[PDB]
Amino acid sequence: SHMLFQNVSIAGLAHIDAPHTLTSKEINERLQPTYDRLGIKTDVLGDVAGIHARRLWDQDVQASDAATQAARKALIDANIGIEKIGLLINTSVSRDYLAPSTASIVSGNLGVSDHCMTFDVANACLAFINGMDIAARMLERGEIDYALVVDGETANLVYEKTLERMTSPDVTEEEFRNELAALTLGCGAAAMVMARSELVPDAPRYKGGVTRSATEWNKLCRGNLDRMVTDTRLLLIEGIKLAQKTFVAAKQVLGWAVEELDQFVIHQVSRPHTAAFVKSFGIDPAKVMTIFGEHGNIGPASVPIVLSKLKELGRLKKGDRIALLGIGSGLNCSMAEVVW
Amino acid sequence: LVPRGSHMLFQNVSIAGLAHIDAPHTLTSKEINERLQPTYDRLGIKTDVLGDVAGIHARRLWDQDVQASDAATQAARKALIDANIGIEKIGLLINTSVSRDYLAPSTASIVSGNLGVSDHCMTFDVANACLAFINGMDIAARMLERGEIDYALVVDGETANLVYEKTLERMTSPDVTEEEFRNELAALTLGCGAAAMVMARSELVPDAPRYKGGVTRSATEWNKLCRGNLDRMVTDTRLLLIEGIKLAQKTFVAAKQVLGWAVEELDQFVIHQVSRPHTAAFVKSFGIDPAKVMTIFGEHGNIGPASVPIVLSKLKELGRLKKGDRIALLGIGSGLNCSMAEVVW
Known about the structure:
4-stranded mixed beta sheet, Peroxisomal Thiolase, Chain A, domain 1, 5-stranded mixed beta sheet, alpha/beta, homodimer, 11 helices, 340 residues, 2 domains
């Protein structure tokens, strides 16, 4: 009985790389006194997490500015003007205010029309995929012809504050390990234009997918603009268990088998998360592009940034079956298919 | 006579349950005015700008330890009892409040954890200032219409304690300027409260009210008019009034085309409220009969996106709604956005 979306396309896609590099060698030089004054012995960022660098924005780029840049790029990629957009959804973790929606700020910056509906979705690192599904459901019903899904992430504050706390005279060491995951984050932005397939006949098709949850674990990863507290070991383990659930579901509603899929575009928390993941499922590592090593974790923008890089590098061919996979704080796990 | 299309109104979507929670502690505008009086005197303010101009006599507050997720959970347990269903039957839970626990995880996932949703249950937050509950209803409705779930919960907890405490500190500073005072004043018309609604496929709840959906228009060039964080809200009330009314005029024209509305055919208007003069101007602009406009602003303030469902709940519990009544759900929210939707009781 389950029907996938059949008239929803991706008309354009774009990403923005933030311009300032902060290396994990430079972070380590700053933290070395504190590493020594408790003899931390391993380089956890570079050697364990597998993050060698991340990007940061210019001072006072807001989430709305970053999303706006990506959106302009995505409109050019779709070859459409802003007057065609009927829905603008912002899916970032970073937000200018509690009200109004960051989506209304981006939409104001772009000059959308008075028919354009706008709102934000929040759902930690899965929100872009939620935003895509929300938009597809409007597209499918005929409410709009084109939608923009946007996401701008700003981590400059979290770096500045996290690094002060960690180089304090007072600073202790249960906190160091609870805080250190904030130094895996990065800045970046992405946007996607989605459309009714009759308007864009050659474009990739979005089929939808499945979601499962384990909300019993909503305590494991709490973040505000200035701080992120995480139980990294436990979110690893309970993530993988939830993904296995979500895979079986994806067997039945999507027809999935690993090996018939051409690419896996996965949210990337760390080299160890990623390796446990692909080993659990026997996925070919070559079908799994990663940017974490140079960009860190860009929250909900990671998925579409990786899809955009796949596209720009020429790796995606007509007919490829693309799996979009995220495990997000919640815990929530969504898995969706695009047919290129 | 002539075969016509649905206008993309929702089919077979119903409201199975509804509930509201009033926050327990009353904060009168008289006690506020007593705290602000030295500032009033230094600024030459001689009228009661809260009680007489804005038209708010009291609002409600939680204990300082109540978070958004906790208020939303309390309302959700009551709405599940009103729908006579267990949490295992919920396939979608959407949080719509402006207030929130954290940037991540979503407040939806904390509420869902507290309630013990199943692992099939999809959860996420929507943020759209005071229209978000309507957006969440629409999102749920598309899923129910399509048959993907049977039941959805839309929940909303608003916590205004912090804004009150910090605003009143700033507004009683010996150095606050007139302009900063006026910019922050609308924070003192906010209230705390919570509401929750269970939506369902109509085949499951054949006597329940139907939700039709409706329309939306925007004026996002006006996105700077009202900005807020958990401790601070700055608002240009004069242009929110002027540009809000103009936006609503446009949205009404679309609502006549799509929902067939004429104002005299509606039995009740559930309108988001920012202030007694804003409401009086809206009702007078559109020719609405004020006996069909329930107000809680006088004793509760503006509870943000929970305002519309609170009002609907309280209409339900007062016995003011009967089978077949056509209920208009209306608001202008910061953005600017305007939504107008219909429920058939």
